[PDB]
Enzyme design. Structure first.
Site, PDB file in Angstrom:
ATOM      1  N   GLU A 125       0.856  -1.176   0.000  1.00 53.20           N
ATOM      2  CA  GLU A 125       0.000   0.000   0.000  1.00 53.20           C
ATOM      3  C   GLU A 125       0.896   1.230   0.000  1.00 53.20           C
ATOM      4  O   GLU A 125       1.989   1.206   0.579  1.00 53.20           O
ATOM      5  CB  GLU A 125      -0.956   0.009   1.205  1.00 53.20           C
ATOM      6  CG  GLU A 125      -0.287  -0.033   2.572  1.00 53.20           C
ATOM      7  CD  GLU A 125      -0.172   1.325   3.233  1.00 53.20           C
ATOM      8  OE1 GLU A 125      -0.858   2.272   2.792  1.00 53.20           O
ATOM      9  OE2 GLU A 125       0.596   1.435   4.214  1.00 53.20           O
TER      10      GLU A 125
ATOM     11  N   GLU B 285      31.694 -12.065   6.155  1.00 52.15           N
ATOM     12  CA  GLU B 285      32.375 -12.013   7.445  1.00 52.15           C
ATOM     13  C   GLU B 285      31.383 -12.009   8.605  1.00 52.15           C
ATOM     14  O   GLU B 285      31.678 -12.574   9.666  1.00 52.15           O
ATOM     15  CB  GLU B 285      33.292 -10.792   7.517  1.00 52.15           C
ATOM     16  CG  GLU B 285      34.291 -10.699   6.370  1.00 52.15           C
ATOM     17  CD  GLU B 285      35.473  -9.803   6.692  1.00 52.15           C
ATOM     18  OE1 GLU B 285      35.475  -9.186   7.779  1.00 52.15           O
ATOM     19  OE2 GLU B 285      36.404  -9.722   5.861  1.00 52.15           O
TER      20      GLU B 285
HETATM   21 MG   LIG Z   1       1.224  -1.913   5.598  1.00 50.79          MG
END
Ligand SMILES: [Mg+2]
Ligand SMILES: Nc1nc2c(ncn2[C@@H]2O[C@H](COP(=O)(O)OP(=O)(O)OP(=O)(O)O)[C@@H](O)[C@H]2O)c(=O)[nH]1
Ligand SMILES: Nc1ncnc2c1ncn2[C@@H]1O[C@H](COP(=O)(O)OP(=O)(O)CP(=O)(O)O)[C@@H](O)[C@H]1O
Ligand SMILES: COc1cccc(-c2cc(N3CCc4cc(OC)c(OC)cc4C3)nc(N)n2)c1
Ligand SMILES: Nc1nc2c(ncn2[C@@H]2O[C@H](COP(=O)(O)OP(=O)(O)O)[C@@H](O)[C@H]2O)c(=O)[nH]1
Ligand SMILES: [Ca+2]
Ligand SMILES: [Ca+2]
Ligand SMILES: [Ca+2]
Ligand SMILES: [Ca+2]
Ligand SMILES: [Mg+2]
Ligand SMILES: [Mg+2]
Lengths: 438, 349, 425, 62
Positions: free
Chosen positions: A71, A254
């Site tokens: 959204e 690493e």
């Molecule tokens: Mg959301």
């Protein structure tokens, strides 16, 4: 030089990504318009900061980042905020309706519709890399997007970038700042399917950040803005070794080598000090021994738990500011004679230490005070499993009554995945028990 | 008003504490699995410490210190004393003990037994283990072979400890005894010693040449009441309280309980609990802890005190339940959850 | 994320009209549809319930339905009558005569297609339709019978959209006719299957509140609707204003409805009004959890809470609301299920309603809601065992065996609520 | 307490201090499951629209 691509998924990931990149620019002297006066390599370069920023002929420095929410209201704030100029439009991907805190909706229903586009846009940045290292994925355990789509993304990144490392920054759910009761389901589901695909995951319990903000910054009711700017400091200290010149933790590999002897047990515990309020106008600056000691106070950990009752498998001390090796060894010698620090018998009892002389950077007008020296301790301790137990228990309470399960099955899932994931967590909880008890 | 939960049904002591908190009118008991609690009267095994202190706006207290088992398990207690610089192998109040798995210390146990054997020193020994309760699992002998053979016969860990051949013997009776002291440690880690102790008394006369008999060398109340015909000949229930023992010492040996024994007791308690303070303290933790401890001491004929074991889930003396249980609530619980002289000796450190 | 509003029948259209009056005021829109407000925060999420139109006007995304023109003629002439789209008045001529069958099977079936036609046009102009909300009574014929028909038709064309309703439940103390328990029982069976959230507004409770607490010796339907519109303003307040937390209808349903059939909520409001004394957070919190502030005539202490949401409006010591919310739970911790952890959530909107500096709305999914259905089931059976008044329905084609089914499903619904009231960990 | 592998530069230093020494799924396999959930979603939707179709019959039967 070897580039790193950050991926920010869901609201939490995106908003935290905003905090990190804001902090990164200030740490590197990059302005909101992307110009970097201190960079004399115009249009390119293979400097240490170039691991996170690309350069354009016009001299703009551009985060190697992708934001993705199902959204748009959250990413819309990025497209219009202070750093709108930093990112170019196709880096920001948005859907139309979110996953409604439904792991199944984010992974299956909506995930299938947007996964191809996201990967395509990630490939458009990987093509600009001469030696891509891997990915840093920021997301929440609780949200539907942060949990469901992230797991889907992690699965397909392991297929398309098989030999590249993947690090997670995961927001562990807390009732104090959540408006959702199903987060335990999404946390267990996403952990189960993502576990095999993550090389190292730094988990942050919002409960820890909440209390730290009100206890050490005397903020009566912290907001996400308060929490994110604190988290970004920790994220920065962890990623600083990739962005500045150094010898320790300079490749994503690493992190796995130093902090993770067993692949499944790849959740290091972060502890950070000092957290000091900006309202305290004059503060007694803390010595190397005091902040190093503070790394073993549970009140400063990113996840509340007791390392005293677990075992260490690795430990890194990431200082930033005015620190020299001698003062560190002094503190460690004193600390070891005063604390309960037991390593597993099959690992050395030692600290890998790194120091950047640049002191921690604080955003102007923030809640944190500038300090002379700070440290972030990364510890792979079995005690972090307490967070799994808490979560596993909440999962068990609801699932015994099949509460809310219909919302997931309705989106295409099978109940089997609930027990299949919960069984995986059972093993994980028992794997931690083997390594660190008795 | 405050809330609490009970998760140990077979607990004599805290049964009265829950009983007495309810009658206060400001405490409310909930089911065995309602996390929305202020206090947990937890279970003796696998108490979920990891799930405490994560309930918003709820101070959570628990009646057990995570990690206190290292002092309350016989095998671990030995390794704690021998490997703790604060205590060290040079410990004057703990009998030379060794941990023997049926890491292991078999040779080093025989090491001194041989040196002792050649030296004509009464090399009498005892083997013990925390598993065998109810006076089952206990062997005394003069040569290792007969003792170590018993250890291998079972499948759990066992410690061999120097049986003290010269105990202080009461008269009339020429009989053995041990001393039980109750110590409360609150959330602040103040050490509170209950002013009332008890002597668990042997009803049979001591016999050094004969340990064949299974009641002249152990006196845990239960053994005497089930395997001795003189349970109660001298005092009610093989339990003598401090007032009487003090008077006896004054009359018989011209000394006091406080001077001759109770100073050593208070020193051993402080030494033991302060040794582990940095490993179990909950001062800056998201949950707090208190716990009741039952220290078991014994006295030799030179009036020296020896610690034998520490019990982390102790029962109390019948007469003292009321006073003691009231003391916990006062100091351990109400100190955290306030409401609308003292019975404890604060062991200062 | 737009919402489409529907109001059907007398009750539905009148509580609907007041709802639009209230929120229109809160957002600063006058009876003509012109914005005249002081803050831009009023407009940030105005699209949620209003379309923007030619001339910088905002028009409610509302559809008005009734089988007789009487009540709808009043709306057009009412205070905000001229705000609604004239094309969105879809009214019949004959009426439903407080007959569920007429609204659902005969008279309503004739008009329903004309209603969905207006729904499609409102939906086709939505950036991302979020769901529908219906206001209606369950005791009449149009709102009850046709309303549940419309719900069934909407789920057919928008099966993946959320369907919510504010349903007014009948009570003999505020009764229009005796066949009201028949219509209610038939409607509930539909709501159990085709709605995601139903706010059970019980007229018995609204009466007792108006009469007993507000000291109104003779309440009118206007007096009850003042409370209903106040609740609807409170339930929707977080969606209508830029609220720190992100509130979505499906995200809200997921968090409130643990089992698909048990989606019948008790609304609550505080303070109860028809004064000037600033109400303190201690007073707001203890009222919303009191039976006397509940819009459903059910005792919460005769049941258990599956989920709870308390919503506070205004500038207030928010540290105090937290302290107190955590206080009221400890007092009633036995009435919250232990198997849904952290099932009490709190939202705050800084903007208060009209005439109050601080307010608080309560939304609870409690198993005590069965008491309402048990009440309706008794009234139903009292007549059905003697088949009284059934001819009104058999004359419209219904069979007594549809009645028996509805009865059974609602007694099944009660049984299911009883299952979880006794469940433990 | 030995100090080892001490590297240092203008930006800082790094080293290690020791105190005590020691005592794969494919793409096709994924695509199927996203589709297996999609087809399960459609079956639930078909079963719904059938149940609704059954109720449309009854409606006009009345
Ligand atoms: Mg959301
Ligand atoms: N630290 C932090 N955590 C957040 C933030 N926003 C959301 N969260 C976490 O995420 C949960 C809410 O879900 P979100 O992450 O916002 O939603 P999402 O992951 O995008 O998934 P959907 O909302 O369903 O699309 C909360 O309970 C938090 O634990 C934030 O800004 N900072
Ligand atoms: N070193 C020693 N010298 C003399 N007697 C000893 C001894 N060690 C143990 N005992 C005897 O053993 C008994 C205590 O045994 P122990 O306390 O270990 O068993 P236990 O812990 O199962 C009973 P409880 O749980 O009630 O404390 C005493 O009666 C004592 O006489
Ligand atoms: C009838 O159609 C509508 C229209 C608008 C809203 C609703 C509605 C409201 C609602 N409220 C109000 C705000 C709120 C916010 C929360 O967090 C962000 C929260 O916690 C998740 C709970 C609540 C409680 N709850 C549910 N289920 N629906 C229904
Ligand atoms: N709150 C409220 N309830 C009403 C109103 N009018 C009717 N009702 C309820 O609905 C029932 C009568 O149904 P009615 O409104 O005539 O349904 P309609 O025929 O569809 O309009 C009564 O039992 C009332 O409880 C009103 O104005 N306000
Ligand atoms: Ca450069
Ligand atoms: Ca891999
Ligand atoms: Ca007709
Ligand atoms: Ca048509
Ligand atoms: Mg014992
Ligand atoms: Mg009417």
């Amino acid at each position: 030089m070897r580039e790193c691509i950050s991926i920010h998924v869901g609201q939490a990931g995106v908003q935290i990504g905003n905090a990190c990149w804001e902090l990164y620019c200030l740490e590197h002297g990059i302005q909101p318009d992307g110009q970097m006066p201190s960079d004399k390599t115009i249009g390119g370069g293979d400097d240490s900061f170039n691991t996170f920023f690309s350069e354009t002929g016009a001299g703009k420095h551009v985060p190697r980042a992708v934001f993705v929410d199902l959204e748009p209201t959250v990413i819309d704030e990025v497209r219009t905020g202070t750093y709108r100029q930093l990112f170019h439009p196709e880096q920001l991907i948005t859907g139309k309706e979110d996953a409604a805190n439904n792991y199944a909706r984010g992974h299956y229903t909506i995930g299938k519709e947007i996964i191809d586009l996201v990967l395509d846009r990630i490939r458009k940045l990987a093509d600009q890399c001469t030696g891509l290292q891997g990915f840093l994925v920021f997301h929440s355990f609780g949200g539907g997007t942060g949990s469901g789509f992230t797991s889907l993304l992690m699965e397909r990144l392991s297929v398309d970038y098989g030999k590249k490392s993947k690090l997670e920054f995961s927001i562990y759910p807390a009732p104090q700042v959540s408006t959702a009761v199903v987060e335990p389901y999404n946390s267990i589901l996403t952990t189960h399917t993502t576990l095999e695909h993550s090389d190292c995951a730094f988990m942050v319990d919002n409960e820890a950040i909440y209390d730290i903000c009100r206890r050490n910054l005397d903020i009566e009711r912290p907001t996400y803005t308060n929490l994110n700017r604190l988290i970004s400091q920790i994220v920065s200290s962890i990623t600083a070794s990739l962005r500045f010149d150094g010898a320790l933790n300079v490749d994503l590999t690493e992190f796995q080598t130093n902090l993770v002897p067993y692949p499944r047990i790849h959740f290091p515990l972060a502890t950070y000090a000092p957290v000091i309020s900006a309202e305290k106008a004059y503060h007694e600056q803390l010595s190397v021994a005091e902040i190093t000691n503070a790394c073993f106070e549970p009140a400063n950990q990113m996840v509340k738990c007791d390392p005293r009752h677990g075992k260490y498998m690795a430990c890194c001390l990431l200082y930033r500011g005015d620190v020299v090796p001698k003062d560190v060894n002094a503190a460690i010698a004193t600390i070891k004679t005063k604390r309960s620090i037991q390593f597993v018998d099959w690992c050395p009892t030692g600290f890998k230490v790194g120091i950047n002389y640049q002191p921690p950077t604080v955003v102007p007008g923030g809640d944190l005070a500038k300090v002379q020296r700070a440290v972030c301790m990364l510890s792979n301790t079995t005690a972090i499993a307490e967070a799994w137990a808490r979560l596993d228990h909440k999962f068990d309470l609801m699932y015994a009554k099949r509460a809310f399960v219909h919302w997931y099955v309705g989106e295409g899932m099978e109940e089997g995945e609930f027990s299949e994931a919960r069984e995986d967590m059972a093993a994980l909880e028992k794997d931690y028990e083997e390594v660190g008890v008795d | 008003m405050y809330t609490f939960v009970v998760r140990d049904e077979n607990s004599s002591v805290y049964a009265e504490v829950s009983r007495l908190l309810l009658a206060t009118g400001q405490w409310k008991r909930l089911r065995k699995d309602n996390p929305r609690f202020n206090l947990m009267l937890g279970e003796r095994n696998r108490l979920p410490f990891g799930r405490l202190g994560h309930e918003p706006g709820l101070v959570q207290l628990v009646n057990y210190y995570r990690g206190a088992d290292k002092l309350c398990r016989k095998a671990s207690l030995v390794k704690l004393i021998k490997t703790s610089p604060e205590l060290s192998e040079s410990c004057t109040w703990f009998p030379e003990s060794y941990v023997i798995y049926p890491t292991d210390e078999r040779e080093v146990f025989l090491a001194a037994y041989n040196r002792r054997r050649e030296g004509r020193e009464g090399n009498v020994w005892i083997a013990k283990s925390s598993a065998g309760a109810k006076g089952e699992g206990i062997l005394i002998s003069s040569e290792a072979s007969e003792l170590l053979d018993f250890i291998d016969e079972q499948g759990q860990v066992h410690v061999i400890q120097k049986y003290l051949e010269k105990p202080l013997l009461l008269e009339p009776g020429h009989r053995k005894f041990d001393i039980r002291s109750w110590v409360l440690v609150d959330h602040l880690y103040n050490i509170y010693l209950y002013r009332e102790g008890v002597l668990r008394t042997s009803s049979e006369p001591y016999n050094s040449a004969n340990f064949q008999d299974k009641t002249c060398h152990l006196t845990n109340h239960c053994i005497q009441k089930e395997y001795s015909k003189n349970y109660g000949r001298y005092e009610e229930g093989n339990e003598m309280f401090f007032e009487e023992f003090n008077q006896y010492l004054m009359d018989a040996l011209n000394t006091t309980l406080e001077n001759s024994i109770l100073l050593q007791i208070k020193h051993i308690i402080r030494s033991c609990l302060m040794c582990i303070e940095p490993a179990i303290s909950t001062k800056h933790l998201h949950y707090q802890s208190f716990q009741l401890f039952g220290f078991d001491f014994m006295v030799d004929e030179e009036l020296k005190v020896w610690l034998i074991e520490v019990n982390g889930a102790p029962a109390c003396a019948q007469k003292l339940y009321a006073e003691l249980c009231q003391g916990i609530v006062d100091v351990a619980i109400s100190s955290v959850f306030p409401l609308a002289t003292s019975i404890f000796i604060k062991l200062h450190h | 994320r737009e919402i489409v509003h529907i109001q059907a029948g007398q009750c539905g259209n009148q509580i609907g009209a007041k709802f639009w009056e209230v929120i229109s005021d809160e957002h600063g829109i006058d009876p003509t549809g012109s914005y005249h407000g002081d803050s831009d925060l009023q407009l940030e999420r105005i699209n949620v319930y209003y379309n923007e139109a030619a001339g910088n006007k905002y028009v409610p995304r509302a559809i008005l339905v009734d089988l007789e023109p009487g009540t709808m003629d009043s709306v057009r002439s009412g205070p905000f009558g001229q705000i609604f789209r004239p094309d969105n008045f879809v009214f019949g001529q004959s009426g439903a005569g407080n007959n569920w069958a007429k609204g659902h099977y005969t008279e309503g079936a004739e008009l329903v297609d004309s209603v969905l036609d207006v729904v499609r046009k409102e939906s086709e102009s939505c950036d991302c339709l979020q769901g529908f909300q219906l206001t209606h009574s369950l005791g009449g014929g149009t709102g009850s019978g046709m309303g549940t028909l419309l719900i069934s038709k909407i789920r057919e064309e928008y099966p993946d959209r959320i369907m919510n309703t504010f349903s007014v439940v009948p009570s003999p103390k505020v009764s229009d006719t005796v066949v009201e328990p028949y219509n209610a029982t038939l409607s509930v069976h539909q709501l159990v299957e085709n709605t995601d959230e139903t706010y059970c507004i019980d007229n018995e409770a609204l009466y007792d509140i108006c009469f007993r607490t507000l000291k109104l010796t003779t309440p009118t339907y206007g007096d009850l609707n003042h409370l209903v519109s106040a609740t609807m303003s409170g339930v929707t307040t977080c969606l209508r204003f830029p609220g720190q937390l992100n509130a979505d209808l499906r995200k809200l349903a997921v968090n409130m409805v643990p089992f698909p059939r048990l989606h019948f909520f008790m609304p609550g409001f505080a303070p109860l009004t028809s004064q000037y004394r600033a109400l303190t957070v201690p007073e707001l919190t203890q009222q919303m959890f009191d039976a006397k502030n509940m819009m459903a005539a059910c005792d919460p202490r005769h049941g258990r809470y599956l989920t709870v949401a308390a919503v506070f409006r205004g500038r207030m010591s928010m540290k105090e609301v937290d302290e107190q919310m955590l206080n009221v739970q400890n007092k009633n911790s036995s009435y919250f299920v232990e198997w849904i952890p952290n099932n009490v959530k709190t939202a705050v909107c800084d903007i208060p309603p009209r005439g109050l500096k601080m307010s608080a709305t309560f939304i609870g999914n409690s198993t005590a809601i069965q008491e309402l259905f048990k009440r309706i089931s008794e009234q139903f059976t009292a007549m059905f065992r003697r088949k009284a008044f059934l001819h009104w329905y058999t004359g419209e084609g219904m069979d007594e065996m549809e009645f028996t089914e509805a009865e059974s499903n609602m007694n099944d619904l009660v049984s299911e609520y009883q299952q979880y009231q006794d469940a433990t960990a | 307490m030995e100090v080892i592998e001490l590297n240092k530069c203008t930006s800082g230093q790094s080293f290690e201090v020791i105190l005590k020494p020691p005592s794969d799924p494919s793409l096709e396999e994924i695509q199927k499951k996203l589709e297996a959930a999609e087809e399960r979603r459609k079956y639930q939707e078909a079963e719904l629209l059938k149940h609704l179709a059954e109720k449309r019959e009854h409606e006009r039967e009345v």
